[PDB]
Design a binder for these strands. Sequence first.
RNA 1: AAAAUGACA
RNA 2: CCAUAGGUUAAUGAGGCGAACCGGGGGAACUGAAACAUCUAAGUACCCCGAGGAAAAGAAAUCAACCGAGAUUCCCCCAG
RNA 3: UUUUGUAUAAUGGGUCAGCGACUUAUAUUCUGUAGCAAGGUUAACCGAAUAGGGGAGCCGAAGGGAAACCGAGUCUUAACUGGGCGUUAAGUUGCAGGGUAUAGACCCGAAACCCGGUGAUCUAGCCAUGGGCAGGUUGAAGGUUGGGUAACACUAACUGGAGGACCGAACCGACUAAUGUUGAAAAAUUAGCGGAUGACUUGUGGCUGGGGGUGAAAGGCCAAUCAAACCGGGAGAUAGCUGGUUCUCCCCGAAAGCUAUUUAGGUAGCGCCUCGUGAAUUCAUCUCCGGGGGUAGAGCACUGUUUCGGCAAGGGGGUCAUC
RNA 4: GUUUAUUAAAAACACAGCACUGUGCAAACACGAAAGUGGACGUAUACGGUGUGACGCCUGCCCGGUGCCGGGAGGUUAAUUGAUGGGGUUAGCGCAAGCGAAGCUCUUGAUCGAAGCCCCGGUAAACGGCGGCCGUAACUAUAACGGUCCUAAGGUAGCGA
RNA 5: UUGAGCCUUGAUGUGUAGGAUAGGUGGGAGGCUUUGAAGUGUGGACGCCAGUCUGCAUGGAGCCGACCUUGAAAUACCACCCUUUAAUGUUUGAUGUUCUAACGUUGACCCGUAAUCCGGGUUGCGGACAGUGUCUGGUGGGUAGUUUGACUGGGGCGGUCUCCUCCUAAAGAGUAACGGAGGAGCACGAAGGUUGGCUAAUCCUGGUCGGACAUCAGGAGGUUAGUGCAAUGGCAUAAGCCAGCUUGACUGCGAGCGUGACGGCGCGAGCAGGUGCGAAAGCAGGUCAUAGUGAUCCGGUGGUUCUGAAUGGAAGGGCCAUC
RNA 6: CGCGGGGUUGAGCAGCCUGGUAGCUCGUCGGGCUCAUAACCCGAAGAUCGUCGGUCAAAUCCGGCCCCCGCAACCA
Length: 552
Amino acid sequence: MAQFVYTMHRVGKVVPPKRHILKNISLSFFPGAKIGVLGLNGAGKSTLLRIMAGIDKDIEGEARPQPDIKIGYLPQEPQLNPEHTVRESIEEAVSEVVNALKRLDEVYALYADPDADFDKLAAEQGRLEEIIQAHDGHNLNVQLERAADALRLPDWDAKIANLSGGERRRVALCRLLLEKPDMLLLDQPTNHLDAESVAWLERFLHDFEGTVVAITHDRYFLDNVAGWILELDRGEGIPWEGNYSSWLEQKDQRLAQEASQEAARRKSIEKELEWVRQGTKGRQSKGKARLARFEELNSTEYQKRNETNELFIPPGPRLGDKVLEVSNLRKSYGDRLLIDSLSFSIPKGAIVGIIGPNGAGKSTLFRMISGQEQPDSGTITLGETVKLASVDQFRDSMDNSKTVWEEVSGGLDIMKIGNTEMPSRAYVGRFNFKGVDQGKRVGELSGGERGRLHLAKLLQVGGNMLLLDQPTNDLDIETLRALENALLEFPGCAMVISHDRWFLDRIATHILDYQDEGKVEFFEGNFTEYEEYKKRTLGADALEPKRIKYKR
RNA sequence: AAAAUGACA
RNA sequence: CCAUAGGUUAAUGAGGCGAACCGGGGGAACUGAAACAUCUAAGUACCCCGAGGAAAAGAAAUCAACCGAGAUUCCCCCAG
RNA sequence: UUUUGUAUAAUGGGUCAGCGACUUAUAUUCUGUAGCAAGGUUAACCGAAUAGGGGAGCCGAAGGGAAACCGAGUCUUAACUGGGCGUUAAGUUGCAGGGUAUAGACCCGAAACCCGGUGAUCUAGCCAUGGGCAGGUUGAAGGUUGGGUAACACUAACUGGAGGACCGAACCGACUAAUGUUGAAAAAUUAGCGGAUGACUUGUGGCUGGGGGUGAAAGGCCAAUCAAACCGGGAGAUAGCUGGUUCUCCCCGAAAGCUAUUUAGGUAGCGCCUCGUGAAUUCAUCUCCGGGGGUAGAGCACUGUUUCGGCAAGGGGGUCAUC
RNA sequence: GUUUAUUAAAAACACAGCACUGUGCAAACACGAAAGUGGACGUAUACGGUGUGACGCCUGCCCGGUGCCGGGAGGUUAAUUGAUGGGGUUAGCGCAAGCGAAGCUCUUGAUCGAAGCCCCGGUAAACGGCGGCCGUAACUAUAACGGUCCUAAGGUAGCGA
RNA sequence: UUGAGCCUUGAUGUGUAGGAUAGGUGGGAGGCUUUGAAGUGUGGACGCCAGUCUGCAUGGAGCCGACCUUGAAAUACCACCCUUUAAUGUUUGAUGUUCUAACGUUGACCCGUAAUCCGGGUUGCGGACAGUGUCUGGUGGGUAGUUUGACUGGGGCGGUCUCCUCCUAAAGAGUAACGGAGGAGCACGAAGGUUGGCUAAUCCUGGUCGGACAUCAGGAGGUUAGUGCAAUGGCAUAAGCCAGCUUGACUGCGAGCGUGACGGCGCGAGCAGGUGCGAAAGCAGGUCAUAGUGAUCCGGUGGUUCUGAAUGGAAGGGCCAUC
RNA sequence: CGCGGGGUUGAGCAGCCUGGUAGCUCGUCGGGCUCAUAACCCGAAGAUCGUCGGUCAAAUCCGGCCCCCGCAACCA
Ligand SMILES: Nc1ncnc2c1ncn2[C@@H]1O[C@H](COP(=O)(O)OP(=O)(O)OP(=O)(O)O)[C@@H](O)[C@H]1O
Ligand SMILES: Nc1ncnc2c1ncn2[C@@H]1O[C@H](COP(=O)(O)OP(=O)(O)OP(=O)(O)O)[C@@H](O)[C@H]1O
Ligand SMILES: [Mg+2]
Ligand SMILES: [Mg+2]
Ligand SMILES: [Mg+2]
Ligand SMILES: [Mg+2]
Ligand SMILES: [Mg+2]
Ligand SMILES: [Mg+2]
Ligand SMILES: [Mg+2]
Ligand SMILES: [Mg+2]
Ligand SMILES: [Mg+2]
Ligand SMILES: [Mg+2]
Ligand SMILES: [Mg+2]
Ligand SMILES: [Mg+2]
Ligand SMILES: [Mg+2]
Ligand SMILES: [Mg+2]
Ligand SMILES: [Mg+2]
Ligand SMILES: [Mg+2]
Ligand SMILES: [Mg+2]
Ligand SMILES: [Mg+2]
Ligand SMILES: [Mg+2]
Ligand SMILES: [Mg+2]
Ligand SMILES: [Mg+2]
Ligand SMILES: [Mg+2]
Ligand SMILES: [Mg+2]
Ligand SMILES: [Mg+2]
Ligand SMILES: [Mg+2]
Ligand SMILES: [Mg+2]
Ligand SMILES: [Mg+2]
Ligand SMILES: [Mg+2]
Ligand SMILES: [Mg+2]
Ligand SMILES: [Mg+2]
Ligand SMILES: [Mg+2]
Ligand SMILES: [Mg+2]
Ligand SMILES: [Mg+2]
Ligand SMILES: [Mg+2]
Ligand SMILES: [Mg+2]
Ligand SMILES: [Mg+2]
Ligand SMILES: [Mg+2]
Ligand SMILES: [Mg+2]
Ligand SMILES: [Mg+2]
Ligand SMILES: [Mg+2]
Ligand SMILES: [Mg+2]
Ligand SMILES: [Mg+2]
Ligand SMILES: [Mg+2]
Ligand code: NA
Ligand code: NA
């Protein structure tokens, strides 16, 4: 009884093609409930989040929150100001209190003035004597000095342009949170965070009540916090009570049963078609009712929209012994040194996984490798046979006003990958972009579809020193494993930057571990062999967490 | 663990 | 001994019949809809119970419209 | 009579005489006639009552708009120089008539549905009771006495009298043929045929009732009637379907087409007929004038097809670098 | 032995025998608005239903469809229950405007909620089903044999114009 | 045995730096401490792991406030506790086991009674189940009511049913067959409106890769080109091709006509209010035209006090737009 | 001929599924293992997707031509 924070009733949704990404989803939520939303890229999870937060009311059905609840919505790709700084971007969040202090000091100026002393005050200041109290505008200074510690935000002077990818998400998380809301709706909240930040956030989420609906492709992240699982497969809402391991078997069972029913329906249709095509045998019935039943049996069902399979990677020029060695590399920004005295040499035909904290120079390394930057010391020495192909860390380089096919190919009926040409339509189709899904504008694309398309567009240079900067951005399990199996077959060299060590556990052959002081160390092997190295030359240190919290 | 066959003189 | 159930005994009443009309309990289908299932035929035919010279109803928890009328029953309009 | 069409070998009629089919309330529209006339007229009812009262009410004299509302105007519209509907031409009540509506609705005619009752004296099954089956055969189990065994088993003679057993009359049936089909008979006669101690047959009396009975099962039987008995009622069910429709004279006089249709043999609007009113040199023939055609015919520049020339691509079988 | 009384007496019906299935007794089942009767003054060696039809030798493979039996985890799931949001009215604050307490009403429908169905097994003397194309051996006549596709399984014994 | 709620008792709340696990206001202040210390073992939950709460060991008379070096201060009552939970009460819900008193008894005995019916009385056995009533989901040819189109060179099977183009079609319009051939159930915020500008297919000669055919140059050419999609009629003033600015793909009307049996469908100058393009004259109420479709009823969503059943409101209607 | 289905490597089959992407098992050819052959291992080849033709795009759509495989020919 009681409770019942949020409700959805027969909430359909129709997209321009014709299909219903959501149809007949009727369910309710309760205080202090954690829901994890699963599905595939295209299942409608982000649209459901937008509806639940109330951004869009173009539904059929009802979607009601209980009155007097604060809703914090974290979207797929939060948009900030490339002009702002961290200080003036975070300061926006607590807006009713900065103006409260400013106006209170101005009223402290104007109150001693004998002009309308009993008119300009009783009507105006009184509306602020509690805006400074309920929100507590006096102690925002210590509030920020404390809340900065937990996230370990970038420096206040830092600019958004100078900010790195993970720190940007950190800032956005602080901005969203500071409102102290009840409903917390997040769409993939841990896109760029490392082990420390992800563990901290998934402890804080579990502690924090008020109901949290989280989109996540990460089994380990979901297991800690989720008390309920929403499936959201093909326009249906399947609620599961349990953990990921128990739900995965039920999902597989459902798929197997649906395939069996499909086969049975096929066989029935063959059997009835034979009778329909038989003769007449005299002046007898032929059964108009039976004909109507057979005609009704010809219905349609949705195949799983993207059971995407192994991607395409076209290798290019043959590559020799020199694989762009690096000697005495040192990098800094003003006085902030990222890397000092780094020297290594990648072998031939290897995959090199790069690991480290947020804003430790990982993207900077690719920047100076691709010629965008320069080294403050030493030199990187390219091999003359080396072809470069580096994937940008951010999806935000496409133009949202163009079609998928036009964006990838360039408006050419035949483009070329590497040296051989092959048709552009086939080249895109190799990335599971069928002819129907060809026509959607790249601004109308899910996160995973956008990532796949951007990867497909950039990988057409036909190079052989693939500098992947987090290709595992918004990839599902099957989408991830397709590329994970395609990469192991790459002839050329692959340098991969990522935060999820489980993906790298299957593909990495060389390791670049970042550390403090700007220390970057090379290693040859996989992560189990790295653990073997640590255990052979060990050190007793496991006291990672402290749980700073936010409020006093 | 698997292991079939070889015209007459 | 309880006491009830019960069995003889007396006087008083009703049993059945009859044409129509009347009140009550049940209650069709053919037909029309140019087929038909909601609907109409129709609370009609028919069955059953009960009286009376008539029977039922009947003295506002009724209408009306800020003006008012005064139980019930039947006839002519309202009005197809 | 029905038809495109009948001497038709298409229907109906043996003949006379009698009977037999467009009617009757009410309502509405039009026509003729009669009375009053911007008015006309009453209903129920009262009444020594076809009179006289009764004007409740109905129609008409004003329309427009969905409505408020306005008013010889109104609606539309922000508004019409507009545009739709109206003003400017008399109605109402009887009588007679032609239509339409609700009633059986011009008359005769179904197979069928529903309701209440009468039927198991014929026939289905079953229940209680008591009769019938001439005559002649065959030899089961069993038993006794002998043989055989340690005992059995087995065996021989005698005896015995079983059976949906055998042949065959009464009795019960009904396989073949002939006769008879306005019969002797609304299922029989004649010569043959099956069962004939049994799951038999028969007398008397009971029980099962109509969407129900009973059925050694055929949709068989339930009073000569059964894929739902008979009698009465709803009931003059419905019939876009056949048949029939009664005295006389004068005038005019068609259609078998289009569109639509659960529609093709029905119906509805229009085209074709008749009666009445009002109107224009209204309409028809002919001569002259102003028109636009793309048919018949003709033709091959075009779309195609068709031969014969002289040119000429270009090409194919061999001969070739037989790259 | 029985049957279409009145055009069909039969290969049809019945039958003894066989099998499956239900039924623990106030039995299943049938006639009955019900009381109550038959079953039966019987009691699983009994009674009802269905198929086959003495006797002899036998009765092969398939649980995919459709029925039946068992399971209860999960999905869906009625009546009841009426939390919530929206709307109407208005005592008042205003006296232009608008807001709107308590009550009363219209609507919306949170939670709870069984059997069935989905799902998991069995069952064929339960209703039923029981394959294609191509090559191959001293006359190329045919295939003991092989290749491949599909099925729930590919017709066995015995018969066969 | 338990889910859930409620009320009271306890406990828990470690950013940095003051002192070191500290949630908020307190109200203000030293009082707590002696139902026997700060101190001496450790009980145990937890921890961010320094320890702070707490069972028991003798004695049993102790800490801080205040100063504040940080934003804030001193666990030294009680308050809705604001947070986790830990309990005992406590209401409700479920799942169970036990009982007797409703109820069942087609178990035994007794009486009415000379009665295997019925009733009553004792006694067992079940027992809040079973059973019945109302509501409700499933199943339900066991039973009942009906439907199952038309054209058609007889019916059935086959084909077809609405719209557009050509021919049949007889030089106005219309005109049939199960006659001869093809299409449609759309698209376009530009492919629409103006203002500027431009004009094709094919063939030849020359020329880098490059040829039979890509781009370039100049000659013949003269619409054999093109139209957003079938065919016919059109198109150079282009209705074809290329750009700018654009929203007339406007609102209310509409002289007068074409075509339909009707429902309806089509063309339309001009008038009023605003609008775009152009220097203006002017053009623009969709697309070169002809297919791209569905009446009424019922209901949904916006606007409008037109109406609002005693009155004021409201529900519900009406009208306009639309599904 | 009235109505349906089919045609893909040397054999049997997918892929026609709403067009951008020609595959499978056996078999042919060349090596290897073995005294030698089968089996087994390794490596290759080839298909105008029946045909005439008409969608940016087909094996995939549609019309036709060719051949093959089934079905129906009822009431008198
Ligand atoms: N205009 C459009 N036309 C066609 N498809 C569209 C259009 N707009 C959205 N879609 C489709 O609707 C779906 C929206 O999915 P959504 O944005 O929820 O992402 P997701 O794949 O469910 O989740 P996530 O990216 O967060 O992992 C996608 O499949 C997207 O392609
Ligand atoms: N132009 C710049 N000016 C100042 N600082 C910069 C600039 N570019 C990068 N940095 C700093 O360099 C550091 C590394 O940034 P980088 O882009 O390499 O991040 P990263 O390690 O890849 O992080 P992430 O996890 O977000 O991918 C950060 O601290 C960032 O603020
Ligand atoms: Mg009497
Ligand atoms: Mg009728
Ligand atoms: Mg009729
Ligand atoms: Mg009386
Ligand atoms: Mg005639
Ligand atoms: Mg004739
Ligand atoms: Mg003649
Ligand atoms: Mg005659
Ligand atoms: Mg004659
Ligand atoms: Mg005749
Ligand atoms: Mg005659
Ligand atoms: Mg009027
Ligand atoms: Mg009937
Ligand atoms: Mg008898
Ligand atoms: Mg005998
Ligand atoms: Mg007989
Ligand atoms: Mg005889
Ligand atoms: Mg005999
Ligand atoms: Mg005899
Ligand atoms: Mg008879
Ligand atoms: Mg009948
Ligand atoms: Mg009648
Ligand atoms: Mg009659
Ligand atoms: Mg005449
Ligand atoms: Mg007819
Ligand atoms: Mg000619
Ligand atoms: Mg016999
Ligand atoms: Mg007979
Ligand atoms: Mg006979
Ligand atoms: Mg009994
Ligand atoms: Mg048999
Ligand atoms: Mg259930
Ligand atoms: Mg029936
Ligand atoms: Mg009827
Ligand atoms: Mg017909
Ligand atoms: Mg003509
Ligand atoms: Mg003409
Ligand atoms: Mg155009
Ligand atoms: Mg121009
Ligand atoms: Mg134009
Ligand atoms: Mg056009
Ligand atoms: Mg009112
Ligand atoms: Mg309204
Ligand atoms: Na998303
Ligand atoms: Na980065």
